[PDB]
Amino acid sequence: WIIRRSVANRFLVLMGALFLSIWGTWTIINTPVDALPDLSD
Amino acid sequence: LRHAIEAVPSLNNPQTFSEQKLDEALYHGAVLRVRPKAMTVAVIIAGLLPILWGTGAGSEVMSRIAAPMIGGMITAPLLSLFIIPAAYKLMWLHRH
Amino acid sequence: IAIAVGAMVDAAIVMIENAHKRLEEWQHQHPDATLDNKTRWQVITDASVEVGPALFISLLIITLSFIPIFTLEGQEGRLFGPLAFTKTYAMAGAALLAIVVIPILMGYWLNRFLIRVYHPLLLKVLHWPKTTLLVAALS
């Protein structure tokens, strides 16, 4: 199935994960923090 | 186990009866599980182990949510290694 | 995300492993000093042939058999809510990446002695194996 169509997208998939990597790294650096999720009614 | 009994030895099994031929087919799906398995079990428990240790803020709840999985990952693999085969060799004999 | 890490790496390895032995069969059936960039291509993508479904559907299993957790109402649902979310997204990512990148990156880049402790008891399990299904029952 999809394992076939994937090998073809060899190059840009790498760059997608290249930007994704530096995109997911930017967000984590700028993510709010707290001890727990708000559990109050 | 299914593809062992779907390969070339699975031409002999559905054609005629040779318990010693299906056993040999389960012994390779046996040694071929160990390598990917022993590691899958190891990576699950090894990576799940740090949270089991409960020193620090929030450790309490994460170590409680962990133990069940780590404990369940000793008996699930250990047992399923012998329970799945001995039940697939036994269920393959009924249709047959 | 912490609890989930043990399973993301699990997605890639079982795939890579079936490839490590699939590359050791081509080595025994063919020559050993001749191979191209494409001949190394076909052997690895052929490891994704077999277990490909088994794992992706197994991670699909791991992220869905957990969904029911979201039904927790009130205070408890707000606590384990975000944990369920991330445990799910983490897998969905590792799963959707073991089909877009993982197979690619693996083609671009004492087991005996545990095997000797196991099969003696395995071959043993085929003794009136029913008796081993009975022993599992008492567990």
From Swiss-Prot, chain A:
Part of a cation efflux system that mediates resistance to copper and silver. Belongs to the resistance-nodulation-cell division (RND) (TC 2.A.6) family. It comes from Escherichia coli (strain K12). The chain crosses the membrane at residues 11-31. It is found in: Cell inner membrane. It comes from the Bacteria. The cus system plays an important role in copper tolerance under anaerobic growth and, under extreme copper stress, in aerobic growth. This is Cation efflux system protein CusA. The gene is cusA. Induction: Transcriptionally regulated by CusR in response to copper and silver ions. The cus efflux system is composed of CusA, CusB, CusC and CusF. The lineage of its organism: Bacteria, Pseudomonadati, Pseudomonadota, Gammaproteobacteria, Enterobacterales.
